[PDB]
Amino acid sequence: LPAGVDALVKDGEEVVKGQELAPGVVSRMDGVALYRFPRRVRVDYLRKERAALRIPLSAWVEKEAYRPGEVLAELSEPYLFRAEESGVVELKDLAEGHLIYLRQEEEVVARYFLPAGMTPLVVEGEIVEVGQPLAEGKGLLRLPRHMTAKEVEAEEEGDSVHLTLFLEWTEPKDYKVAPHMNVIVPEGAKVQAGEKIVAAIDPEEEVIAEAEGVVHLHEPASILVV
Amino acid sequence: DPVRQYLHEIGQVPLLTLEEEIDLARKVEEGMEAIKKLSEATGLDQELIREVVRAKILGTARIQKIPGLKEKPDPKTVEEVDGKLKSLPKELKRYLHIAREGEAARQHLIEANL
């Protein structure tokens, strides 16, 4: 198969006669196909944060486990997300949503989460203070589909309820292999933080995981079933 | 016909581009160093277990059975080397396959450049 062509079926998977393995690839037999010299490997890293979220209870959906797409609260009327800390902000765009890093001087004084559709009212690294409308929801605002919220934290002052969260998401990145390279780790495998992925000529071209991730093989030079 | 013979035999197996080539050479060297690695496992010379790979690879009974009336027979000077390193943990038993695949890849690259 020519460059750019990706194999639909995953590595080490049963393939029926005639079944497509790619746009122009048509299997001629029943067996298990294997990737040969994958020309690209996409690794999605895992990133965790304990964010603080503040939303009025009147509209809040009370849920311990928020999965991707799980609808986060309601927000009857558009609600300003009020700052509980003064310092230097920051904006981490999380897919549909965002994240605020509030830091006095260097270290952070707190961690903040913005659900999908809850928009940032402050520039990254901008001068801000407490009691300040950091974000705003227009209502609705479900959890992002690339991120899971484990381990909810329940606390309430009355009207606007403050819940801390345990956030686990992913940040995918691609690595295009070269002829001087060869895949080491197998397809679909849990990968240690900071480990060799694809062995190369010089140790430089060698792929070294930036964080605890997962490995995925894509668009190999060729594939064959046996 | 012997003339056409070899030509049609090698014309059966294709060539190798940079990808396959570099890979194959890497496989071979990995098998070699794997042998040197296992050369300290039981204390066997890097050349010894090296040919011991041949016993199950490019023929079973045909590599050592007739290099003359005497050589390194399968039961005597071979079998005690085949079932010796045969009991070693993961960190050893893996280099076995590294040497298997390296040894095969050698012959492969050869056939490719034939």
Swiss-Prot record, chain A:
Protein name: DNA-directed RNA polymerase subunit beta'
UniProt similarity note: Belongs to the RNA polymerase beta' chain family.
Domain of life of the organism encoding this protein: Bacteria
Known role: DNA-dependent RNA polymerase catalyzes the transcription of DNA into RNA using the four ribonucleoside triphosphates as substrates.
Quaternary data: The RNAP catalytic core consists of 2 alpha, 1 beta, 1 beta' and 1 omega subunit. When a sigma factor is associated with the core the holoenzyme is formed, which can initiate transcription.
Included range, full protein: 171 to 396 of 1524
Underlying gene: rpoC
Curated annotation (Swiss-Prot), chain B:
Span list, region Sigma-70 factor domain-1: 1-35
Record's keyword terms, sorted: Cytoplasm, DNA-binding, Sigma factor, Transcription, Transcription regulation
Location in the cell: Cytoplasm
Lineage top rank: taxon: Bacteria
Keyword Transcription regulation: yes
Biological process annotations from GO: DNA-templated transcription initiation
GO cellular component: cytoplasm
GO molecular function: DNA binding; sigma factor activity
Record's keyword annotation contains Transcription regulation: yes
Quaternary context: Interacts transiently with the RNA polymerase catalytic core formed by RpoA, RpoB, RpoC and RpoZ (2 alpha, 1 beta, 1 beta' and 1 omega subunit) to form the RNA polymerase holoenzyme that can initiate transcription.
Family from the record: Belongs to the sigma-70 factor family. RpoD/SigA subfamily.
Domain comment, as recorded: Contains 4 domains, connected by flexible linkers. In the active conformation, the domains are in an extended conformation, each making extensive interactions with the RNA polymerase catalytic core. In the autoinhibited state, sigma-70 factor domain-1 packs closely together with sigma-70 factor domains-2 and -4, contrary to the extended conformation that is seen when the protein is part of the RNA polymerase holoenzyme.
Function: Sigma factors are initiation factors that promote the attachment of RNA polymerase to specific initiation sites and are then released. This sigma factor is the primary sigma factor during exponential growth.
Protein name from the UniProt record: RNA polymerase sigma factor SigA
